[PDB]
């Protein structure tokens, strides 16, 4: 229950919590690199050099579980209060367009990292055994090392006030009026 | 508080 997030991802998360709350700038959705794309690249990259079907299947099960838990949790425990209006607007857009929401294909890597950070608390909240806990933590730490090897591809620092291709977009007074009102 | 002094 002691997850080891590298300090770089700690800095990224602390940029996130200091954006969505202080700067009031929600993420750009749909993102350029959604959860599906990052997880799929992780699988296709690491499984290419793993040994034994046991490991090549541990990876495949871990990514699938990550995606399936992300899809069911993002709406529940991964949005700051500000982002819960972007989420609602996406949900209503899906309902009107008749295309059920699939957060893995919409939200980006930052929310996956939020899920990672909150993971130990969720693990502790269950009766889930020690072996599975060890395996989960090991896999997640391996994933975070991988993300470190590719940090300047998913969490680059761009100015929402100087480029439309930034992971964050400044909100509107009428947006955060409803979101925080 | 984030408005004119108002009434």
């Amino acid at each position: 229950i002691s997850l080891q997030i590298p300090i770089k991802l700690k800095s990224v998360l602390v940029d996130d919590w200091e954006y969505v709350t202080k700067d009031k700038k929600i993420c750009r959705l749909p993102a350029d690199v959604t959860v599906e794309m990052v997880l799929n690249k992780y699988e296709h990259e690491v499984s290419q050099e793993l040994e034994s079907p046991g490991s090549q299947s541990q990876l495949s099960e871990y990514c699938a579980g990550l995606k399936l838990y992300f899809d069911k949790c993002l709406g529940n425990m991964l949005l700051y209060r500000l982002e819960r209006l972007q989420y609602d607007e996406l949900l209503k857009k899906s309902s009107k367009d008749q295309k059920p929401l699939v957060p893995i294909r919409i939200y980006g890597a930052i929310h996956l990292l939020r899920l990672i950070s909150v993971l130990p608390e969720l693990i502790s909240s269950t009766t889930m055994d020690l072996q599975s806990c060890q395996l989960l933590i090991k896999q997640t730490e391996d994933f975070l090392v991988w993300l470190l090897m590719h940090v300047d591809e998913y969490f680059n620092d761009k100015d929402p006030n100087r480029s439309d291709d930034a992971l964050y977009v400044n909100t509107s007074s009428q947006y955060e009026g409803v979101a925080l009102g | 508080x984030x408005x004119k002094x108002x009434x």
Partner: protein
């Protein structure tokens, strides 16, 4: 109480020949004037406290006969083209869809899915916890027969089985970083309702310091020469501004010669408000920073809007791996002046040589052009 008669009070065939005006009594003696009722004169108390112990010239009625109905411009309509008082999810205040069963309360945009205030499902709404309570009956054997089946049907992701299982039984919760990541940065600190603050945010002032300060105090260091105490408090000496290099206070007989001075929140260097062009003391919002400190965001254009940020301060995880110095040794921008987020330790002379050769080799490069 006479019945609220419908005024028209038709007599024979809807001729309404007779009326019945409503009784006023109320909306009169209403005592909503900012004083006493509008139909009554000033009170005897107000009289005693307050007293000191040409209609033919009115050119107002002659306005309708010189006002011309004006209709120019577009003018075509341009036709065309009991219950908790805080949200259990984000822990804040607002309108709530209080549960009939559970004592918890949520916002309308904090539920899951978010619910529109004007399109409520109405009737009776249950929270996830009470829905699970009635779906489980609180006994452990049936819950086992349900959850083990769930795990079995989720064998493809059995590694995540119980994590998937336990979501259904949890009410929505606002995301907040666990303390084991915020602690990595001592500077940061949560706010009153999650306003995530840094060292750069000024300590909030109290109501005593704003609403109770008398004439000449608070933000009111703009109304009198009363705050001549821009003298160094600790030493009793004069706070000298860094630019003009003098302190201006004039006299009580020449307050117009005084110039406002402020001390930087980060490094207590005094500055004249007129030297760092400013119109007011901060007193609020963020901490003022001199124009004499190093940048944090170094937005660069070469568009190539490449950003540079100074790594956030780390817990004493922090590393300072010593150089062998001289040119090169490209740090990003992080430095610890000395006589993996590794704060490089550049000492004093290295900076001299690095700037020297930067500007010189750049001038020779210009020569190359």
């Amino acid at each position: 109480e006479e019945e609220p008669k419908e005024l028209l009070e038709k007599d024979s065939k809807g001729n309404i020949i007779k009326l019945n005006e409503p009784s006023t009594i109320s909306e009169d003696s209403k005592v909503s004037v900012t004083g006493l009722p509008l139909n009554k004169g000033p009170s005897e108390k107000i009289k005693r406290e307050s007293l000191w112990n040409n209609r033919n010239d009115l050119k107002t009625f002659l306005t309708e006969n010189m006002t011309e109905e004006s209709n120019i411009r577009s003018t075509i309509g341009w036709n065309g083209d009991e219950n908790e008082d805080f949200c259990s999810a984000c822990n804040q205040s607002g309108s709530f869809l209080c549960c009939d069963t559970c004592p918890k309360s949520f916002h309308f945009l904090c539920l899951d899915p978010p619910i529109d205030p004007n399109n409520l499902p109405k009737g009776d709404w249950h929270c996830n916890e009470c829905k699970f309570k009635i779906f489980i009956n609180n006994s452990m054997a049936t819950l086992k027969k349900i959850e083990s089946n769930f795990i079995k049907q989720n064998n493809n992701v059995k590694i995540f089985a119980k994590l998937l299982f336990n979501i259904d039984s949890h009410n929505p919760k606002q995301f907040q970083l666990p303390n084991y990541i915020k602690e990595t940065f001592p500077a940061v600190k949560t706010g009153s309702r999650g306003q995530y603050s840094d060292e750069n945010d000024k300590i909030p002032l109290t109501d005593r310091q704003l609403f109770n300060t008398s004439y000449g105090q608070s933000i009111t260091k703009l109304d009198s020469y009363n705050p001549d105490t821009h003298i160094d408090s600790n030493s009793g000496k004069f706070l000298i501004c860094y630019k003009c290099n003098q302190t201006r206070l004039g006299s009580w007989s020449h307050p117009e010669n005084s110039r406002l001075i402020m001390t930087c929140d980060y490094c207590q260097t005094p500055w004249h408000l007129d030297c760092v062009p400013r119109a007011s003391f901060k007193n609020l919002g963020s901490k003022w920073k001199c124009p004499l400190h190093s940048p944090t965001k170094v937005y660069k254009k070469i568009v190539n809007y490449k950003v540079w940020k100074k790594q956030r301060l780390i817990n004493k995880n922090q590393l300072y791996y010593e150089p062998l110095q001289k040119i090169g040794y490209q740090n990003n921008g992080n430095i610890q002046i000395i006589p993996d987020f590794k704060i490089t330790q550049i000492d004093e002379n290295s900076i001299k040589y690095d700037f020297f050769d930067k500007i010189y080799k750049s001038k020779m490069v210009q020569k190359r052009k």
